[PDB]
Design a protein around this nucleic acid. Structure first.
Ligand SMILES: NCCSC[C@H]1O[C@@H](n2cnc3c(N)ncnc32)[C@H](O)[C@@H]1O
Length: 393
DNA sequence: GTTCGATGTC
DNA sequence: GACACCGAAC
């Protein structure tokens, strides 16, 4: 991976270190950040780079090169400035995940990192590691995916950062050519507290940061681009999640194992539905995208709630709210399934038209832009609903 | 019981 | 450039 020059130059403008200060680049390869910071701020620092691949490591002689897994690396002294672009990726089995390490190494990661949660990500580990290796008052400048702002895998990371110092987040979006990742820059300083959220505008040479909002009391809550529009909507309405039990569909292997599930259409078999069957305001009951068929009346053996018509909301159509009422009660292999809480009664058509409204599409795009290519549970449960828009107690 | 994607597909 | 994983992982 190459970090585009304008991205590097932006990060370097946010980078500060005392003269004589220790300046580290994790996962450095040839050390573009060390080169760039030296170019900009001068020669009077101790430059250090850590690189796991002896073939990749190629620092200039003025910098100390270290052959090490940065995540397991225990240097003698902490650092004044840490900058770079860590590896992004989930550590898992090669058939599904891009990061492949010997099980014992992954075990060491889980052991070393307090923020490690769920499948997690190499970049979350690099972020926590960077903070633990920082002197008080020390500065971190990383470019990472936006996903940590909102995702549950990084809930510990956000809490960690919020208690460890002060955090500035700069949204860049999709800045890496021929590479599908919405990026942010994090400038973290190991002192003080609070979050600052910034937008950016692209310049000829770098990025111009524009302050969006401040949260001096941030404790690790999800990070969103809130406006007066999004705030009014939320305070005026009820959150969807106070009205509904929200579940996800049974997964592919759960259908695979089921003794009445077939790979072929036939007598008394209904398609197992996917996200492609879910449409704004309706369901495609015909087309099969799963490769799986089963008897409709046996669906409830996977999930109880497949037995009754209920609200289905999309998960993988980007940051959007695509909802339908499944009136036929089919087996689903995908999507959110929302079942009314005790005492909650619904008007399915009003609720579906409200959730599919352009007003709603705007609301979620404002808040979550393109951090993730999903509508997540965290987003969905916070969708505001008024009783006129299809619920009563 | 459900999450996540330096991506894949078209 | 729109719209989707799907199953290993916990
Ligand atoms: N900084 C540019 C992208 S990150 C990719 C680089 O980081 C290196 N890398 C990946 N994992 C590493 C680790 N755990 N410790 C040090 N370097 C690592 C790779 O060898 C590669 O050179």
């Amino acid at each position: 991976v190459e970090t585009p020059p304008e991205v590097v130059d932006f990060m370097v403008s946010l980078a500060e270190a005392p003269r004589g200060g220790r300046v580290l680049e994790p996962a450095c390869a040839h050390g573009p950040f060390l080169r760039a910071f030296r170019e900009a701020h001068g020669t009077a620092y101790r430059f250090v780079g850590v690189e796991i691949d002896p073939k990749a490591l190629d620092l200039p002689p003025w910098a100390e090169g270290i052959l090490a897994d940065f995540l397991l690396w225990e240097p003698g002294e902490a650092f004044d400035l840490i900058l770079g672009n860590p590896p992004y990726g989930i550590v898992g089995e090669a058939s599904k995940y891009p990061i492949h390490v010997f099980k014992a190494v992954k075990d060491l990661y889980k052991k070393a990192f307090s923020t490690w949660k769920g499948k997690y990500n190499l970049y979350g580990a690099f972020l926590e590691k960077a903070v633990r290796l920082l002197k008080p008052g020390g500065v971190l400048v990383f470019v990472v995916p936006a996903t940590w702002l909102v995702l549950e895998d990084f809930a510990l990371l956000r809490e960690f950062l919020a208690r460890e110092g002060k955090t500035s987040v700069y949204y860049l979006g999709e800045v890496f050519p021929q590479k599908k990742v919405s990026a942010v820059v994090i400038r973290f300083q190991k002192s003080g507290k609070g979050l600052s959220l910034w937008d950016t505008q692209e310049s000829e040479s770098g990025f111009t940061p524009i302050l969006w909002a401040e949260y001096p009391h941030w404790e690790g809550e999800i990070i969103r681009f809130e406006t007066e529009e999004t705030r009014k909507l939320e305070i005026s309405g009820m959150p969807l999640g106070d009205l509904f039990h929200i579940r996800f569909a049974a997964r592919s292997p759960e259908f695979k194992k089921h003794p009445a599930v077939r790979k072929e259409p036939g007598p008394g078999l209904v398609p197992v539905l996917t996200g492609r069957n879910l449409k704004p305001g309706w369901v495609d009951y015909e087309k099969n995208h799963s490769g799986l068929w089963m008897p409709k009346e046996r669906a409830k053996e996977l999930r109880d709630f497949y037995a009754t018509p209920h609200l289905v909301v999309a998960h993988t159509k980007g940051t959007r709210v695509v909802a339908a009422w499944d009136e036929r009660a089919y087996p689903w292999r995908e999507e959110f399934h929302l079942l009314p809480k005790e005492g909650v009664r619904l008007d399915p058509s009003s609720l579906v038209q409200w959730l599919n409204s352009e007003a709603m599409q705007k609301h979620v795009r404002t808040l979550y832009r393109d951090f993730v290519p999903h509508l997540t549970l965290r987003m969905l449960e916070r969708l505001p609903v008024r009783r006129e828009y299809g619920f009563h107690t």
